[PDB]
From a paper:
To infer the ancestral motif from which tachylectin-2 may have diverged, we separated and aligned the five-sequence motifs of tachylectin-2 from T. tridentatus. Tachylectin-2 is a near-orphan protein, but we identified a sea anemone homolog which is 44% identical in sequence and essentially identical in structure and function. The aligned individual motifs were assembled in a phylogenetic tree and the common ancestral motif was inferred. The caveats associated with this inference are a limited number of sequences and unknown phylogeny (the species where the two lectins are found are not closely related). However, because of the high sequence identity and unambiguous alignment, the prediction seems comparatively robust (34 of 47 positions predicted with ≥90% probability).
We characterized the evolutionary trajectories and selection forces underlying emergence of β-propeller proteins, a globular and symmetric fold group with diverse functions. Propellers comprise four to eight blades arranged in radial symmetry, with each blade comprising a four-strand β sheet. Second, tachylectin-2 is an immunoprotein that agglutinates foreign cells by multivalent binding of surface GlcNAc- and GalNAc-decorated glycoproteins. The repeating motifs encode both the globular propeller fold and the rigid binding of saccharides between propeller blades.
Residue numbers in the entry: 13 to 249
The structure:
Amino acid sequence: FNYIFAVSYDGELFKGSPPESAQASWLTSATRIGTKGWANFSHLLFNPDGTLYGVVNDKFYKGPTPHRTSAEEWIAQATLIGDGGWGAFRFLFFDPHGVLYGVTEDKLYKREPPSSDEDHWLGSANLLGAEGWGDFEFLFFDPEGKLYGVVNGKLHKGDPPKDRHDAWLGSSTLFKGELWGNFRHLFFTSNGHLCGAHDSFYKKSPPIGLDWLAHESNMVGHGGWHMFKLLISPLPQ
């Protein structure tokens, strides 16, 4: 079993099985686990250990997945792990190992996540890429820890760079297609299905291959997805 988590523009948070049926209403099959205020975060992301991390008002938090909770109740109970600078991250996202990656000021960094706001995260983070990361439209991992990035509407994959001298984009593998920036959401499920959504949701089960995602044959939710601000799914540990 794995799940998609969706924040709507009404500030509700839903949990449900990934969509498979183009005519089905995915919301009908889903459970509301967050009641209100969930669209107020700048960032919301899963740790593969199953903890939810979130950035709201430039502060970073971690806590258990909510169980019919407002965003306010959740934040009040969460551990504060950062204060100042976090809202500016273009991307913040975990690898399958629970190592935090982040893009800020055009650069890519990784490090164990903070556990307190005294821990200046950038101060000891590993610089992976000195330039060009601020132009990506998406940047995310699969369950195997391959990195995926969209730039100039094209989707690239490759082992993540290990230091600033790895020319990642230069050595990466190119998907077919030049409309990958037209998705609002593009991510992997826990079980390695590639998901892309705008108003409609497209999903490719493994093997993913290198074909264009948004083919009529991969459509699993025809219409109605414009209601979600965020769709995420945890990677396994």
